[PDB]
Amino acid sequence: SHRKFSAPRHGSLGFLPRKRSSRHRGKVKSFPKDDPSKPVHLTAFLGYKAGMTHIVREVDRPGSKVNKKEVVEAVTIVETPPMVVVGIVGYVETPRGLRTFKTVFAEHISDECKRRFYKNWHKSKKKAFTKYCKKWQDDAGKRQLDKDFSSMKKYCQVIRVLAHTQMRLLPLRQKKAHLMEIQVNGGTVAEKLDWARERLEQQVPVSQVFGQDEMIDVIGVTKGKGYKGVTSRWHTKKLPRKTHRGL
Amino acid sequence: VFRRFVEVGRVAYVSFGPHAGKLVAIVDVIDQNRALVDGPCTRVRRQAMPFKCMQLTDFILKFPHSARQKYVRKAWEKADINTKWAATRWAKKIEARERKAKMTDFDRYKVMKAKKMRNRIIKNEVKKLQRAALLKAS
Amino acid sequence: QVLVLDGRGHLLGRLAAIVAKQVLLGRKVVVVRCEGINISGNFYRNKLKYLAFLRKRMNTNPSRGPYHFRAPSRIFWRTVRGMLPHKTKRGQAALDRLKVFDGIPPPYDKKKRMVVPAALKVVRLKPTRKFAYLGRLAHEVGWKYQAVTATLEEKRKEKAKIHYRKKKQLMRLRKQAEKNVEKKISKFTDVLKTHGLLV
Amino acid sequence: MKTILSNQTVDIPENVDISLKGRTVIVKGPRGTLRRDFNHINVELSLLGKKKKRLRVDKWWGNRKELATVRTICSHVQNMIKGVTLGFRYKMRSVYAHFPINVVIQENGSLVEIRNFLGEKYIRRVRMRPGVACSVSQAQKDELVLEGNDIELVSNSAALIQQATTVKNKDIRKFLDGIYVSEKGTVQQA
Amino acid sequence: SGRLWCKAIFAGYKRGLRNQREHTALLKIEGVYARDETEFYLGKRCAYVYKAKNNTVTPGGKPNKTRVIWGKVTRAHGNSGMVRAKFRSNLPAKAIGHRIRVMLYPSRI
Amino acid sequence: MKASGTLREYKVVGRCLPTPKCRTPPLYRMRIFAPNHVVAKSRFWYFVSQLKKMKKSSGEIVYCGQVFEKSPLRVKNFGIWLRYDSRSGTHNMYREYRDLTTAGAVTQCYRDMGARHRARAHSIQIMKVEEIAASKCRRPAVKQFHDSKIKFPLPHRVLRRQHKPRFTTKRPNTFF
RNA sequence: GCGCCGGAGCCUCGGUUGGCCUCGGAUAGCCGGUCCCCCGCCGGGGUCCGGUGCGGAGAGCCCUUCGUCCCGGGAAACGGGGCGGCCGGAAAGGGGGCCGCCCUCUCGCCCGUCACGCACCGCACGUUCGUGGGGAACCUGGCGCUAAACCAUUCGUAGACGAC
RNA sequence: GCCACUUUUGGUAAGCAGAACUGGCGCUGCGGGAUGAACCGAACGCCGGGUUAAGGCGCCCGAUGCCGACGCUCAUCAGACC
RNA sequence: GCGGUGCGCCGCGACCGGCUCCGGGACGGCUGGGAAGGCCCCGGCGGGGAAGGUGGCCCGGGGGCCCCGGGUGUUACAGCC
Ligand SMILES: [Mg+2]
Ligand SMILES: [Mg+2]
Ligand SMILES: [Mg+2]
Ligand SMILES: [Mg+2]
Ligand SMILES: [Mg+2]
Ligand SMILES: [Mg+2]
Ligand SMILES: [Mg+2]
Ligand SMILES: [Mg+2]
Ligand SMILES: [Mg+2]
Ligand SMILES: [Mg+2]
Ligand SMILES: [Mg+2]
Ligand SMILES: [Mg+2]
């Protein structure tokens, strides 16, 4: 027999493998679609959730009851120290997808970013990129690692810069700096890469990524609440008091 | 557009069947897909024959659609079809097709020894011509 | 010892019915450019058939349900493994010798690829019937790489024409050299013409 | 029944230079060129006669469902000759009961904004077809003139702006408003 | 100094749909694809040649690893030039879709 | 009867057995179209049982012989009057064919009505076959071959002999 | 104690028995030229010339292996084989072309002349890709490498336990 | 006890109940009907060679990879074997 | 040397016989004492008929005398019955 009383189903099936996220850093599944008309700009940034507070502002929407009245609105502070760019990576469109092509790192990268390549920074001897950084200080390597920019300016469609947070400046216990590919959306691929190889091993602040009163998207992992029950997770109806094996 | 038309009096080479390899002449188109043919000078008897087996040459010889084999032979050897067929590039590349099938082992050896030198002489000429064109470019 | 089949203008199951048998007879088959496989019947019947195949998901776990491959090469792969006995290990060792490719990748772009006349649209459909492109069907049933593979194939065509112009040039140098050499290869040619190779 | 042969000649006039590249035709004359490939139609197009005065379409061994496509080819060639000699002027009139249909022409004949249709505030922006020039005719108060070479472009750009002006959820037999195709003639005459 | 055996693929056993008879091999000889062409190969010697681990003795030579199973072609099989053969020990199903060398030497020319 | 192969055309005569009522019966002749003389003699005692009060037991085949066609090198027109059974009802017909032999047109008639009407050979009866001169012909699918200047190409030569070259380089040509 | 570059063998897994180095594509139409002509950065198109049961043919092309010895003819000489530089590669990257050098050869290819090479005595898996893939231990040298992971401790943005 | 051709009773009808003739299944494998107590072929000691039946011969899958013959058929629900 | 018996293992060839599948030749019988067709503008001499009408004649168009349609008619510079 059917349901006597129809009712919409609990939960959404679009978010269905409700598992622990494999990543701690929120990952951008799709950067904004590129077009060669606009000037070059980063399209993502990282920040840290500080907390919540109020706002009072005067609203200007002609038609509401709250035009030229003043609401309060909850807001969230995200501390965003300027992120240090430490590499680029290119991507070639393939019939099987979009393959990475040639990752090129900077010369001097900081040892808060070097923490990321080590599961145990104490026991290690800090040997990462030591044989790689010596390519920047000889002509045998300089003509090697600018010939590949010349191949990235031929065969890559998507150039994504490779930045990292600067966790020296944060109040946290952690020092291992998160790092992120940020897609550079701008002119041709030559302009797009000869913009970022000067941003290589230097700062990028927030104010030349975003602006005021712009809508953005927040990527991140939720506050974990543990192994919880079906009425706590899926919000199904609590069975009545009289039930024998739990309600 | 089209160049070979099935009509009264076109010579047709025959692909397969019992009379494969013989020219024939269309007398009268019986149906959509079968036709009354004969070759009075190529040893193939007056009969019907479908269009699935006959390939059309560009030879028309003129005789009426009810004419008998006595008068088809006259318009055959008038136009002299049997020598014009052997002079065609068609029959030369069916005759050179069957010479390679007739080729024995000693003939296959002699052909191998001939082409082993003839390709080398051609290639030694071609790689003189290539650098001659390159010195012309230079 | 590796058979490279073209895929343009071949009927889907009519090509698969002989790819399956050459694969079972131990012959390593790589078919290529499965974009231009065309299916008979019109496009709307074929799209309705593939959407009906998309409707066939296992009710309790569609992840365990039938994997509806959207790429044209893997549509052709699944329609070969329908024809192969893929449960048995000879069918599994058969499917390991079929290698499908969307477009023509660089292992096989500079290799001469073969055409089956016995599975081909202009031979096995009468010309007033209307067929259906597997590339367009796979695209607007959810294969994401039509335009990418189309630009890469256009890049391959504008380079294969550079190859073919040089091949024409070499053949013209050859047939202009042969008249220069016909006085000294007059007796090397004559024994070829008497054995049916150069007339 | 397969008939053995159907054909139908088309007399091309003096000023028209017609040519045909295999099965794809090109008709040239005063106003321009029109090209329309018949690569679906499976016939024999032959440009017989020196001085090149007639096109002749042949169909060999055709049943009636594909013999129907002979005067179709002849009529597309005749509408292809007409749109290069004379052109295609479709005049179409805006019938309005109460609210005036305010048509303004933008992008020098390529875009039509239709306003105030039944007093609605949504404006119909309809793009024309490449080769068609819309205009508001003088010496007649509300009449649009669509002129061009291809009849399938002129008539389709007429039907687009005619189906852009429809009523919704009302008695169509009473709310008889909209732009409708009134006269189907040539641009210049003979 | 060259090759002296025709190429053949061991297609399967002589089989009905629900029954196979392992005392008769189906050989698909490369090049012949019709019964008017399979006339030459009747009664020819043929061999399934395979390597293994332990050394066998090779006639006319030192012990190798390569072993054989000999047999002869018996009769044609269907219109596509497929042919039947019988080997003196029945073929393992390992050999399905591998290369049986069909000899020339019981020659009838 | 099944219309096996090509049909042959038989002149079968027969009569009932002599009785003291009538010592010499009249002899009856039919054109029986049949794959062989055994089924020809069976169709004879089918039709003569439908016509006369005569059966195989009280009668005999006086002469069963294949009547050969008298001009098999002239293309001729044939009119065949017919009688067959549909899924519901019996229909009289008149079909026209164009062939070399009188029995070739009949074996074309059986394969045409099996094609078009799903009429099987036991259901089809055959009553008259006439050689018809080209003025008295009235079927448009036959009369279109009645011109002295007949002319047509063979436009779309579909490739037969497909699996003989099976894997080639060249695409097969179709225009010849 | 590891990676790379340049020797004898052993164990194991087995399959194979010459390569085809590529236009796009039409199919009621194609292929190859010529350019005398018209525009573009050599390419497109017209004209004309050839093919079109495809012969600039996958019914096809290339290579062809018994060896050496002399002497002659035909072919080569600009070629044959061996060291430094210029380019050709991204969809899953090209052991290809070119410029030099110090060497070297009238050798190779096609006809002939001359005789030799276990002629192993009629008999099977021979003939290759094969320096095959993998696995250990032996060899001698050259130039280079000296790491991370996991547990234990801690954290609490995570947590049934692991995991993070 | 059950099923099937044809004859047949009750019942709207039934993979229902009740008869007659004969053959089956049960007691019975095998080839075919994908699948299957009964249908089509065929009944069995253990094997080699040949050949068939019913049914098949794109591929699973032995066999049409015949240059098979003549037509009909377009289905945005095609059709496909007691 | 003869006769019997077998070879340690793996193989081959020859002829004879049985049982089968297939190929290549060759001859004869019958029928409507085969039916048709082949050879003697050509089976002969006279007679006839039309058409899926050859000449020719006329009209029309594509022309540079040829080709293509349409009409007439009965052997002509084709043939058929
Ligand atoms: Mg409900
Ligand atoms: Mg209780
Ligand atoms: Mg209302
Ligand atoms: Mg070996
Ligand atoms: Mg009962
Ligand atoms: Mg009961
Ligand atoms: Mg019993
Ligand atoms: Mg039984
Ligand atoms: Mg069933
Ligand atoms: Mg029965
Ligand atoms: Mg048996
Ligand atoms: Mg079956």
B76 membership: H or E segment, kind and range: helix B69-79
Which residues lie below 8 Å from residue D9, measured CB to CB, with a gap of 6+?
A: D48, D54, D55, D56
**Touch between chain E and chain A: 3 or more Cβ pairs under 8 Å:** no
In 3D space, the residue among D74, D73, D85 whose CA is nearest the CA of residue D13 turns out to be D85
Q: Is C24 on the interface with E (CB under 8 A)?
A: yes
Q: Chain C contacts of E95, Cβ < 8 Å?
A: none
The alpha carbon of F2 is separated from its chain's Cα centroid by a whole number of angstroms, namely: 12
In 3D space, the residue among B51, B48, B44 whose CA is nearest the CA of residue B20 turns out to be B44
The alpha carbon of A101 is separated from its chain's Cα centroid by a whole number of angstroms, namely: 21
CA of E68 relative to ligand 4 center, distance in Å = 12
CA of F97 relative to ligand 6 center, distance in Å = 61
Q: Which residues pair with F129 in a beta bridge?
A: F80
**Ligand 1 ion local residues (Cβ < 5 A):** A 6
Task: Give the closest-approach CA distance of D23 to chain B in angstroms.
Answer: 9
Cβ-based burial of B79 (10 A; exposed 0-12, middle 13-18, buried ≥19): middle
The answer to whether F138 CB sits below 7 Å from nucleic acid chain I is no
Question: Residues 135..164 of F with a Cβ closer than 8 Å to D: which?
Answer: 140-141, 144-145, 150, 152-153, 155
Given in angstroms, what resolution was this structure solved at? 3.4
Q: Chain F contacts of C9, Cβ < 8 Å?
A: 171
In 3D space, the residue among E2, E1, E27 whose CA is nearest the CA of residue E14 turns out to be E27
Token output for D146: 């669509």
- Cα gap D150→B121, rounded to integer Å: 61
Whether residue F98 contacts residue F75, with contact meaning beta carbons closer than 8 Å, is answered with: yes
Q: Chain D contacts of B1, Cβ < 8 Å?
A: 44, 46
The answer to whether B16 CB sits below 7 Å from nucleic acid chain I is no
Whether residue D175 contacts residue D96, with contact meaning beta carbons closer than 8 Å, is answered with: no
CA of A217 relative to ligand 5 center, distance in Å = 76
Neighbours of chain B (3+ CB pairs under 8 A): C, D, F
Backbone angles phi, psi at B26, to 5 degrees: -75, 130
- Cα gap B63→B27, rounded to integer Å: 8
The answer to whether B28 CB sits below 7 Å from nucleic acid chain I is yes
Cβ-based burial of F72 (10 A; exposed 0-12, middle 13-18, buried ≥19): middle
The answer to whether B74 CB sits below 7 Å from nucleic acid chain I is yes
The answer to whether E72 CB sits below 7 Å from nucleic acid chain H is no
Q: Is F173 on the interface with C (CB under 8 A)?
A: no
Cβ-based burial of F68 (10 A; exposed 0-12, middle 13-18, buried ≥19): exposed
Q: Beta-carbon neighbour count of residue B43 at 10 Å?
A: 8
Q: Which of C5, C115, C118 sits opposite F163 (nearest CB)?
A: C118
Which residues lie below 8 Å from residue A103, measured CB to CB, with a gap of 6+?
A: A87, A88, A89, A162
- Cα gap F100→F77, rounded to integer Å: 8
* CB spacing of F145 vs D4 below 8 angstroms: yes
The CB-based long-range contact list for C45-51 (8 Å cut-off, 24+ gap) reads: C45/C132, C46/C132, C46/C137, C47/C132, C47/C137, C47/C140, C47/C141, C50/C137, C50/C141, C51/C141
- Cα gap F79→F77, rounded to integer Å: 7
In 3D space, the residue among D28, D33, D6, D8 whose CA is nearest the CA of residue D18 turns out to be D28
Q: Chain A contacts of C148, Cβ < 8 Å?
A: 93-95
Whether residue F49 contacts residue F30, with contact meaning beta carbons closer than 8 Å, is answered with: no
Cα→Cα distances A104→A160, D49, F145, Å: 11, 70, 80
Whether residue B10 contacts residue B60, with contact meaning beta carbons closer than 8 Å, is answered with: yes
In 3D space, the residue among A143, A149, A137 whose CA is nearest the CA of residue A198 turns out to be A149
Whether residue F152 contacts residue B51, with contact meaning beta carbons closer than 8 Å, is answered with: no
Chain F interface, mutation test: which of B31, B36, B38, most F Cβ atoms within 10 Å? B31
Token output for D19: 């040519």
Whether residue B51 contacts residue B6, with contact meaning beta carbons closer than 8 Å, is answered with: yes
- B98, closest residue in chain C (CA to CA): C196
Neighbours of chain C (3+ CB pairs under 8 A): A, B, D, E, F
Q: Name residue C179's amino acid.
A: K
The alpha carbon of A11 is separated from its chain's Cα centroid by a whole number of angstroms, namely: 27
Question: Residues 65..84 of F with a Cβ closer than 8 Å to C: which?
Answer: none
- C-alpha count within 13 angstroms, C-beta hemisphere, residue F24: 0
Experimental technique, in short, is: cryo-EM
Cβ-based burial of D127 (10 A; exposed 0-12, middle 13-18, buried ≥19): middle
The CB-based long-range contact list for A226-233 (8 Å cut-off, 24+ gap) reads: A233/A18
In 3D space, the residue among A137, A129, A139 whose CA is nearest the CA of residue A103 turns out to be A129
At residue B111, the 3 state secondary structure works out as: helix
Q: Is D46 on the interface with B (CB under 8 A)?
A: yes
* CB spacing of E96 vs C90 below 8 angstroms: yes
Token output for F41: 């003699």
Task: Give the closest-approach CA distance of D43 to chain F in angstroms.
Answer: 9
A175 CA to G150 C1' distance (Å):
22
Token output for C119: 């599975």
Q: Chain D contacts of C127, Cβ < 8 Å?
A: 42
Neighbours of chain E (3+ CB pairs under 8 A): C
Task: Give the closest-approach CA distance of C192 to chain F in angstroms.
Answer: 25
The CB-based long-range contact list for D99-108 (8 Å cut-off, 24+ gap) reads: D99/D177, D100/D142, D101/D142, D101/D165, D101/D177, D101/D178, D101/D179, D103/D136, D103/D142, D103/D144, D103/D179, D105/D134, D105/D135, D105/D136, D108/D133
Q: Are strands C28-31 and C38-39 parallel, antiparallel or unpaired?
A: unpaired
